[PDB]
Amino acid sequence: SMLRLQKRLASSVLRCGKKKVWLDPNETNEIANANSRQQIRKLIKDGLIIRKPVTVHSRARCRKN
Amino acid sequence: VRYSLDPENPTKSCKSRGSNLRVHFKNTRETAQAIKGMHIRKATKYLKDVTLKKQCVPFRRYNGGVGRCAQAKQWGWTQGRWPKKSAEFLLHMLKNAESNAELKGLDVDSLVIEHIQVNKAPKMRRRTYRAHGRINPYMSSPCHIEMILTEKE
Amino acid sequence: NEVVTREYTINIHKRIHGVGFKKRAPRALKEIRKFAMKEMGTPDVRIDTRLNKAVWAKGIRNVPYRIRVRLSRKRNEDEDSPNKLYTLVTYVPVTTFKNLQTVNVDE
Amino acid sequence: SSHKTFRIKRFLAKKQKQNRPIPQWIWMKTGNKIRYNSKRRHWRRTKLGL
RNA sequence: UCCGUAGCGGUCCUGACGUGCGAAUCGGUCGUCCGACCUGGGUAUAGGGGCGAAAGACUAAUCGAACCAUCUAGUAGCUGG
RNA sequence: GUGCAGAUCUUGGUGGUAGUAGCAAAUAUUCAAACGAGAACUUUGAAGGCCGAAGUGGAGAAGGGUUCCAUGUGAACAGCA
Numbered sequence A: 001s002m003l004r005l006q007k008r009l010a011s012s013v014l015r016c017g018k019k020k021v022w023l024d025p026n027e028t029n030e031i032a033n034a035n036s037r038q039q040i041r042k043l044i045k046d047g048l049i050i051r052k053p054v055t056v057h058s059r060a061r062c063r064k065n
Numbered sequence B: 001v002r003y004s005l006d007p008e009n010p011t012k013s014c015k016s017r018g019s020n021l022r023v024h025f026k027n028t029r030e031t032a033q034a035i036k037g038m039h040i041r042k043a044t045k046y047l048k049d050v051t052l053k054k055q056c057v058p059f060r061r062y063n064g065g066v067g068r069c070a071q072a073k074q075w076g077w078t079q080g081r082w083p084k085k086s087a088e089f090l091l092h093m094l095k096n097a098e099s100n101a102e103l104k105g106l107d108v109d110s111l112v113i114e115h116i117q118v119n120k121a122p123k124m125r126r127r128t129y130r131a132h133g134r135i136n137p138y139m140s141s142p143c144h145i146e147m148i149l150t151e152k153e
Numbered sequence C: 001n002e003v004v005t006r007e008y009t010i011n012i013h014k015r016i017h018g019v020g021f022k023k024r025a026p027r028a029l030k031e032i033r034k035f036a037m038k039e040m041g042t043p044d045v046r047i048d049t050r051l052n053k054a055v056w057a058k059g060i061r062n063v064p065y066r067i068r069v070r071l072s073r074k075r076n077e078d079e080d081s082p083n084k085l086y087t088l089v090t091y092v093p094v095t096t097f098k099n100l101q102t103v104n105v106d107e
Numbered sequence D: 001s002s003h004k005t006f007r008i009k010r011f012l013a014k015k016q017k018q019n020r021p022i023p024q025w026i027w028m029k030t031g032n033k034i035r036y037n038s039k040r041r042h043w044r045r046t047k048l049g050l
Numbered sequence E: 001u002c003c004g005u006a007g008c009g010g011u012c013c014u015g016a017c018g019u020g021c022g023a024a025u026c027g028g029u030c031g032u033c034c035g036a037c038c039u040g041g042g043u044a045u046a047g048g049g050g051c052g053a054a055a056g057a058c059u060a061a062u063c064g065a066a067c068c069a070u071c072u073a074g075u076a077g078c079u080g081g
Numbered sequence F: 001g002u003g004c005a006g007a008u009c010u011u012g013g014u015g016g017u018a019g020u021a022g023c024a025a026a027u028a029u030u031c032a033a034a035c036g037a038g039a040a041c042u043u044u045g046a047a048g049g050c051c052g053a054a055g056u057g058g059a060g061a062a063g064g065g066u067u068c069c070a071u072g073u074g075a076a077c078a079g080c081a
């Protein structure tokens, strides 16, 4: 449907960007009726919103150099 | 509503009408001239083929800069196009005429499109921006479409 | 007879030759979908996300030359369409494209 | 700007309140000629002076 | 003081564009870049006046005398009806 | 205040051009699913990319004045949708 609001509030709750927020694609309709920060912290606890890890920028090559 | 042409047999004839339809008038006129002599099943099949680019609309009067295709040689013409929006609008209107015929109890498979015409609707106004601070019209050219079916066996 | 799956290999290097750098991987997707429509007579062709990964694995300008593709013609599900059967198009990982015929796999 | 004065903010308040459409029941009246609100203002088009 | 970035500017292609992104822009190439440097805000100077490292330049896309209203329906041995 | 064919006449409306010029500055999109009458353009996930700390990032001043936020609509606008 439209999850523009949920990703914004999840980014604000997790203190990361919208780049790292993972919404569950299978459980779209259960996230689609969250519309609040308190109910989005619950879905973060339940695992329907996951903070993705940082993209790897390895330092090992120029350490080797 | 005062129609332009009266049917020769109003018991066995049904009507359909549409006003202020946001379609190009020239494309609508050329495809209505293509539809004008057809039976309703052939017209529905050919309008589906126009949107699928299997058969074309020959552009006979408003043909300035219209390219040439191979499919126009079935019409004895060289320039043809495939107006998709214009084919869908008078397919919706042809379905409306089908529903009006079923209301009057006319036979479905004997309907031949006896009358069809396209008139110019009032033009509606937008504005485009040109060089050296000049602003030019961006006028739309909508159409009124009118058709009458007749049982012709 | 109507529900059948089998494995082909597709030479993207001859299906690609001539098109510019920014359109090679989308043209490879369109050529795979066109090959599926020609080989299984269904206009409804659905390409797997893993196959999209396999075509776009390097980038947009260096598409892999050959690719191993399993076609599975299947009966259509609910919301009965004008299409009656569809074709699921699946990546098959393989090491060498040497002496691989058209293999008729079975369920 | 965000550094408004009281008189400017009050003028903006009035010009905000005049920017609503007409109520639906006024053109059921007997001596009525109004079709819509012709004194309307959009923030992008008309820049209100100031 | 020299090369050179940000900034400031605008040589050449008399390139692009030229019913344009644009009533003066864009690309490459260029001048300068610690000082007569660049810049915001405040303030002063008003039309035969201002201000000018001086081109009759600038003075709200208007400058060898800005813009608005009035005298004004100014006059025309001239043009068109 | 009495007769129009003209005054690059005034105002309003409409043609041919013409479905034509054009919708070409800044590397780039692809697959699947959801909502829906309708999906190249909405949303989600997986990719492949770009801006690459003098940023296409995060905050302010001037200016704007509700453009901020939530829900609904797809009549008109957002030069395709």
Ligand SMILES: [Mg+2]
Pocket: B060, B061, B062, B063, B064
């Ligand atoms: Mg002609």
Ligand SMILES: [Mg+2]
Pocket: B064, B065
């Ligand atoms: Mg021509």
Ligand SMILES: [Mg+2]
Pocket: B128, B129, B130, B131
């Ligand atoms: Mg323009």
Ligand SMILES: [Mg+2]
Pocket: B133
């Ligand atoms: Mg301008």
Ligand SMILES: [Mg+2]
Pocket: D044
């Ligand atoms: Mg503006």
Ligand SMILES: [Mg+2]
Pocket: E001
């Ligand atoms: Mg020096």
Ligand SMILES: [Mg+2]
Pocket: E002
């Ligand atoms: Mg120097």
Ligand SMILES: [Mg+2]
Pocket: E014
């Ligand atoms: Mg030049």
Ligand SMILES: [Mg+2]
Pocket: none
């Ligand atoms: Mg030109």
Ligand SMILES: [Mg+2]
Pocket: E021
């Ligand atoms: Mg442009």
Ligand SMILES: [Mg+2]
Pocket: none
């Ligand atoms: Mg003095």
Ligand SMILES: [Mg+2]
Pocket: E053
């Ligand atoms: Mg000077």
Ligand SMILES: [Mg+2]
Pocket: none
């Ligand atoms: Mg001189």
Ligand SMILES: [Mg+2]
Pocket: E077
């Ligand atoms: Mg004389």
Ligand SMILES: [Mg+2]
Pocket: F001
């Ligand atoms: Mg009189």
Ligand SMILES: [Mg+2]
Pocket: none
């Ligand atoms: Mg006259």
